[PDB]
Amino acid sequence: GQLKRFSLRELQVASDNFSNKNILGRGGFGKVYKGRLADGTLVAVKRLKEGELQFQTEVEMISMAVHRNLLRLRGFCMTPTERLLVYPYMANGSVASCLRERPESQPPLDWPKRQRIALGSARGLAYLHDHCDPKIIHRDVKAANILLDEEFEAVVGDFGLAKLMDYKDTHVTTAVRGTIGHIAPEYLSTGKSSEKTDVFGYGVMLLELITGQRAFDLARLANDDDVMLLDWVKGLLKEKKLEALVDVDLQGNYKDEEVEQLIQVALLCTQSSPMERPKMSEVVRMLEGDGLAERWE
Ligand SMILES: Nc1ncnc2c1ncn2[C@@H]1O[C@H](COP(=O)(O)OP(=O)(O)NP(=O)(O)O)[C@@H](O)[C@H]1O
Fold this sequence. Notes:
This protein has two domains: 89 residues, Phosphorylase Kinase, domain 1 (2-Layer Sandwich), CATH 3.30.200.20; 208 residues, Orthogonal Bundle (Transferase(Phosphotransferase), domain 1). It is 31% helix and 12% strand. It is built from ten helices and twelve strands.
């Protein structure tokens, strides 16, 4: 059949009565917990703690959107109290973590793994926008929200802010949330989200993969550096040298032209004009080889 009906308790224990040394982090609608299941499976679970109904959309999503580069929901928990969402635990955690951390001294993401990540994730997003009945606007595209499987393939996760369109091509009016780093200018400006605001987010996601930096960082301010990742990088055209901009942890890897390629893509996706941004399928194409050299003026 599919779609697992769970009973709070039989997942309090799976989370070892939940809290404490089981917190992968404070989520968007509560907290994320790593538990097991009776048979064996590592799951991560979302717990809610106090309008919304944001829950029921994340639940019947499964029934409208499935794809190997999209986190598949394992199951949920209702209860006339608070509610829960259970996704597979992801072997290698977020792209954020793998860049932001790591533990003891675990290794960094090499450049070709970063290229795969950009590709799969765009593939997952392209599918959301183009091959789903109501189109699905994700609304939280960022490195923290791209998860990695055991083979380090990207899966797009956390569908907390996802919206179902229809409403033709444009527009989904709804209040601005997420963090400052990944919000499109028109979005904050006009309170409207759309596929092109995902594109912007995805293009900032790439800047993170390439630089290793957060999108909005006071530590850069602590210097004479831009608080805004995009701004910082555009310290490219001027001050020559990727080198300084490219993630220090890479040294060994990448060929100049490799990175320049991804950057152009990131740049194309974060243009202030939504109309000139690529569609994600165009993005995939370019990651796939088709039509980047001329995409710009
Ligand atoms: N299925 C999963 N497997 C492994 N780790 C997960 C899973 N789901 C979420 N996480 C982790 O939960 C931690 C918190 O992420 P999350 O709280 O969902 O993002 P967020 O709070 O909404 N945005 P941000 O503040 O930028 O982290 C992350 O560091 C993820 O690594």
